[PDB]
Amino acid sequence: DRATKLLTYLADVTVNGHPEAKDRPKPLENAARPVVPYANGNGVKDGTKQLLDTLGPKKFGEWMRNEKRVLLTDTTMRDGHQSLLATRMRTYDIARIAGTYSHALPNLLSLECWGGATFDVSMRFLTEDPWERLALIREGAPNLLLQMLLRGANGVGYTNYPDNVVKYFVRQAAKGGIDLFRVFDCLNWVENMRVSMDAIAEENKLCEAAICYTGDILNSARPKYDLKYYTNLAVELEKAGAHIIAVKDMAGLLKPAAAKVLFKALREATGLPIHFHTHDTSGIAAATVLAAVEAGVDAVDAAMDALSGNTSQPCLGSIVEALSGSERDPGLDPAWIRRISFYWEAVRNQYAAFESDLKGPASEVYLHEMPGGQFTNLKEQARSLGLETRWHQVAQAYADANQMFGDIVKVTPSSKVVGDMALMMVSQDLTVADVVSPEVSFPESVVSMLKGDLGQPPSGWPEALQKKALKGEKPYTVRPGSLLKEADLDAERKVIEKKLEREVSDFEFASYLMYPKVFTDFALASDTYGPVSVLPTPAYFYGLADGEELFADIEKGKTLVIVNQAVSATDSQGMVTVFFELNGQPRRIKVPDRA
Amino acid sequence: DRATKLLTYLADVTVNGHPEAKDRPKPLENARPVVPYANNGVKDGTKQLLDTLGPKKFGEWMRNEKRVLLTDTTMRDGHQSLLATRMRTYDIARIAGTYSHALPNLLSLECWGGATFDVSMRFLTEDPWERLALIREGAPNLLLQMLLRGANGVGYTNYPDNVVKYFVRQAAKGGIDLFRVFDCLNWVENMRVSMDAIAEENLCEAAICYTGDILNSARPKYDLKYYTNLAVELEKAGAHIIAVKDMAGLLKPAAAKVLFKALREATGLPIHFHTHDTSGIAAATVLAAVEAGVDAVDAAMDALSGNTSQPCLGSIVEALSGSERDPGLDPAWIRRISFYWEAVRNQYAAFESDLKGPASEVYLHEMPGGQFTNLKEQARSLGLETRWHQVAQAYADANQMFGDIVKVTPSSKVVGDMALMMVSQDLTVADVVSPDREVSFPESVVSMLKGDLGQPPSGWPEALQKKALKGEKPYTVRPGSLLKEADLDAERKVIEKKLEREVSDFEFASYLMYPKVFTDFALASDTYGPVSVLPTPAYFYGLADGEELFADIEKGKTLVIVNQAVSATDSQGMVTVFFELNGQPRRIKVPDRA
Amino acid sequence: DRATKLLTYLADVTVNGHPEAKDRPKPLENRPVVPYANGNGVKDGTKQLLDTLGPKKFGEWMRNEKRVLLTDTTMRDGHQSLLATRMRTYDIARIAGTYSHALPNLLSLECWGGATFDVSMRFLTEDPWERLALIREGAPNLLLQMLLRGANGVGYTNYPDNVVKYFVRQAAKGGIDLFRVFDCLNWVENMRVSMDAIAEENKLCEAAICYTGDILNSARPKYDLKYYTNLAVELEKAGAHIIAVKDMAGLLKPAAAKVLFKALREATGLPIHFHTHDTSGIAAATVLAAVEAGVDAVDAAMDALSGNTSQPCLGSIVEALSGSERDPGLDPAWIRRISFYWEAVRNQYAAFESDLKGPASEVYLHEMPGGQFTNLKEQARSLGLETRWHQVAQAYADANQMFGDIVKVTPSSKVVGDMALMMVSQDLTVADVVSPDREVSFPESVVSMLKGDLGQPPSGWPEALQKKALKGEKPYTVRPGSLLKEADLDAERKVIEKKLEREVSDFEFASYLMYPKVFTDFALASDTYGPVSVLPTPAYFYGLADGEELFADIEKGKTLVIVNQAVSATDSQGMVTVFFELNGQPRRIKVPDRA
Ligand SMILES: [Cl-]
Ligand SMILES: [Zn+2]
Ligand SMILES: [Zn+2]
Ligand SMILES: [Zn+2]
Structure with missing residues (x-):
């Protein structure tokens, strides 16, 4: 009956295709399966997981601070594919390589592999449990820290939630396998991070409080976000019980000359170790990383070569090659980085359906400040609304919208708010002057933000916009969650x-x-x-070819051998019959003809 | 009759398609690039300066200039790496004026030499000279830059000295101001003829090609002294500018800080840095080079930057904005030009490779950005698509076998041929040089080892050379010295x-x-x-049924062409296309090549 | 502008096809050639004789003539039965001179009236007068024969007398020499107006008695020998120059011929003319019997349009008679040559071929006119009764009997058709139809017949049926036309x-x-x-192929050379442009894209 279930899924996608892949591109028919590197044979050298276990979070932080080598965090299992492949990457391919990381790169600080879009996408678009995934990674890499991005007021959700709910999620995330929580708030509002950070501490795990980077500190024309802005936030976040401070450069804006400044400054502002996350949209983020390294940052993020670049993280292989031999050498085998990358490459070719059209670096990022993770997504939405040929006007509108909202920090889900606003602005051909003129029906999301639902920015909301937009509704300025019933x-x-x-x-x-x-x-x-998650990726999205033989592991130990022998015409009752051979025995599965 | 000829071409591509595009991908049916409406006359730039100062003194000016000087590679190296050099005069020339008006402070435009000379005639049916002339006319305030191949010129073989000398005279007369000359084996003796010619025509940018790793004591063959000595040698040989041509994109930031401090100490000549972004970190190296005092650096427009191209011009500029060494270029204008290039690019869908992003593997194989895709496609041809990483490994091993050489055109082709055979025929290095395995080496490998691409600092490996040359006596004089005038x-x-x-x-x-x-x-x-006057879509794809086209045959005169209908194929194997030219009916007969 | 008009027609058919052919079969992708004739002038024929003798004396001449006189129906009844009357003037006119030169001994050419008049305008875009005129010009030595419908003329309804009269005057002026007038219920009072008109135009009045039932079957006494002979004596008294036996359904069996013709010659001095159809597959036997028994003139179609629901084979009836005392005296090699032409002409009309496969004795049961048969079969398929055709046939027989055993020809046969079809559709028996229970809504045509619109049969209409059908309306029994205002x-x-x-x-x-x-x-x-009629048949139904060259004669002397050079895609204004070359000159014709 578990097998019967699988056979039904396979029969269905064979006859009707997967909705997420049915009309996007297919992978090159060649299709060289990804092969897990044969590993030497030895056991696993202890790493950071052991350390945190022995030291606890406060003392672990002090250890990072004092560590001379730069510490690395691989984002391939999360941010890399969330940016490049619409987060569509499956547990099957992710779990299979966890052990190779464990055996081959034990000096890694952490694996970013949970939170962000993964939680929701995995169930919604991949028919798989995000918990099962974390469990599998945990089991495979018991010497590395497992890192998630946690969304502060939302947790991993899409709305605001009562505090006990956030609290409850965090307890479970911890029990589930997460060691390092990178918590951020879209408006950099510390009051809105408190509940979360308290919960992480109460679970005795690493609370990495993130300051989101925006604007330009070395540009005196834009004083709203200067050096003092960040250093103060760091001091504030330290006082709020962070074990680690992180600079979350979601849009990939931090420029090298600023890094030299910002990181000297932050280490002086706080005893806490500093962790730098960025995106390579500019095509120069690696420069920035290396600067941050030179200037003494404790830990930085990078993606495997085969999922690096552009809206992703900059290239992990090359940052390492750059640092090799230097005083701050991170100590990671490049041959191994390369081999894991090749795996990723082969894995990626399976996801052809989810490739975007982005052709390379864009300094335009310095104009719009779209998060790497929103960029493609907003572009596709723009095509949807028939604006494909005005994308640069959309970009400009976004920049204008930002300024109109008072120059806000644009990240999930505030960046969605600015998105919605820009899109309308182009569609309906409205200027900023037009928007705030003394009749516009504003997006639900904009109404919501201005009411107070995403919190409050340092200087509050523009009075005039807010009045017009709220159309009567009285706005609030307390912490959003504080108003939701336990x-x-x-x-x-x-x-x-x-x-x-x-x-x-x-x-x-x-x-x-x-x-x-x-x-x-x-x-x-x-x-x-x-348990469809056990199926290899091609089979999952595409079913089986006529004649094709598949090995699928239903329950660790037991392997099913499945052959697609034949597919019937559609019968009077609207059904198709697939003729399988399961472990040498005939089986006939009936599915509906959805066409 | 010029119109009749164009109508014939259009009729032919309409009925038969273009051979270069017939079986590759098509551009998104949506779709045209629009030249930015520009505000004034043109502020004088470098072209004026060189005119007044001459080359020696121009170099001194660069040396003393505080701002970093930028060279745009979009018109040459950018599309040579990303689009198989298939970019057309039509799209190139149209923007030259916008560069001239909008970015006058630019040092130069790289837009000639390399693959462009040969590919433009061979695959685009257009004159490389007509192109240079048109760019010249559109941007009379900027220096026009070419990459010149030293012993070959822009050719594919070695040529007698007078022939090299002749080309350079014409190149200069044609409109080129800045010659970046290089030699594949970094052999100064092989550059001399070329450099002397450039000087005789009154800017000689002598290039040292970067390979290995200077900060790696495990690989001493190419240490800091290597480059600084070459610089002093090239200065003595009459260079006006010294250039670091990092063809493979190997120079790492920590090395830039060192190498550029050292070079400026080694020579009074200004330094020019060219690199490729295969690593996905070349921008870091550029910026390092700028911080360490380099005079001039290369970058491609955003829409044709990254990967095997140059790093992003737009972002390097944004990074330097506000700094003491600020290059002084309007980013809104960089962005706008880029947007044009982006729209220009979508036309060339047929020539896009499959490369998905950065690869640190580049530090292993050292394949030039410009050879990479090309060698991958060749590998697929030979049925090796699924062993590409073994090809990469073989290339690294081959390099070492040849004694660790500088791999650039056409030496890099030699290593390429070698690696491919090695994988095909499943031969190790030990195998290749075995006294037991009969190997028939590539023509190119026999040639290099005979001495045809010149001589590396330590010569050729005795054992390999004996086996490969199979009797033929090898020489070590300058290749051209043996060719009859x-x-x-x-x-x-x-x-x-x-x-x-x-x-x-x-x-x-x-x-x-x-x-x-x-x-x-x-x-x-x-x-x-003059097929070159046709917009790109029309050139590769002809005209749709019903479609109206505007084409400018002779500046002033505009033709209006409509594809009204296409006949079935007649008994004599011909198809008749029914045009409307300027409101007059015309019937053009072309053969059915299918 | 005449040419421009033709080019437009050609452009339209080329792009949209002809409605009558668009969805029927095409002709074999693999032209009719008019036989090269010796070169002599034209021997005088019957046309000259009638001219010299007048109609009364012409009939006496036929009576006394020893050979049997032949009437070729190919130009009319032949294709009206086999090809839905779709034969074009282009093909008909082109051979008329070959008849004239090659078969001058022929009595007449049936080439007008019946379906032709109406179908030629309605489905062939051509003037039935232009046709008659062209035939006239081609064959000035033969009589031109029409079938004229008596009360209707050639129309579809009843008309005032003056109108009937007017048509006949024109018909005669048009070129018609021999009028075979018939009445669907064999009612002489309904023929009188017509016959009087023909005589007043000094033309041949062939009065037809319609044959039905069986004279040698004592079980069916309604139509016995005396029936016909009396009719003959009646029609002679009414001014006929010729009596004709119109066997529309091909019912006359040979034994009966021997009897009926002996008898008729004894009943009247007027000469007898025998028309029949070969649905039985034995009509030739009956013809030959009629000849042996002394009939003056018989009908036959050319070989290539003979058999089945057509006339029996002219070629073979002639070969049979060759050498005998009554030998018709016609060159068989010429019959064969003209027949070969018709064969090539016929392949052009593939679209209009029925599916009939050969003889059917079933004809003795349903008595459907040769000319109605396919037509009613197609209508039956329309109503979804394809697989019940024999039930249809049976209903027709039953319906006939129900109406009191009527003479079934146009348009009475249409009435019986309509009844039968409803009977099968609605699953009603005769007992059902006339039941004082089952509420039946009779066909308009049945209501009409029974009111009195198609005249009155010898014994009137069945009282009970008529009451039920007429649903209040009082029926009349005077001559239909007599009630229509002049x-x-x-x-x-x-x-x-x-x-x-x-x-x-x-x-x-x-x-x-x-x-x-x-x-x-x-x-x-x-x-x-x-003048689309000047276009050859393939061109008319199918336009011109890409590249194809066509010769068309717009105005005798002048020949146009037309080449289809190219056809555009459909433009924004919904139009297609055809590129012609007319006599060496470029021409562009725009037609709408009807698809
Ligand atoms: Cl009508
Ligand atoms: Zn991120
Ligand atoms: Zn280059
Ligand atoms: Zn008939």
């Missing part, structure tokens, strides 16, 4: 357990709390189709 | 009789470099007319 | 002439009177498209 967690669990006619795990409950509808759908899908 | 008058009579007409000096120059390509091109020109 | 011919001409904004010819007016709407439409078509 959730009755027991009743809300009863709700899901009745709907699914069974008990759920704490993790499943956590998922439900963040994404009630997506989770519900996924649970139902699961009951129907079985 | 060409009787330029007789050789001109040859082409002029064959083409049944006089040729211009530039045409003769073309013929000398590429006898067969030129011949073909001339013949094509007589048949098809 | 038409004010002058006003009615003003009507057409204003509508067409021009004078019309008498012939045109005649056409209008018979078929107001069809003619109107044709006149408008003519203004648009020019």
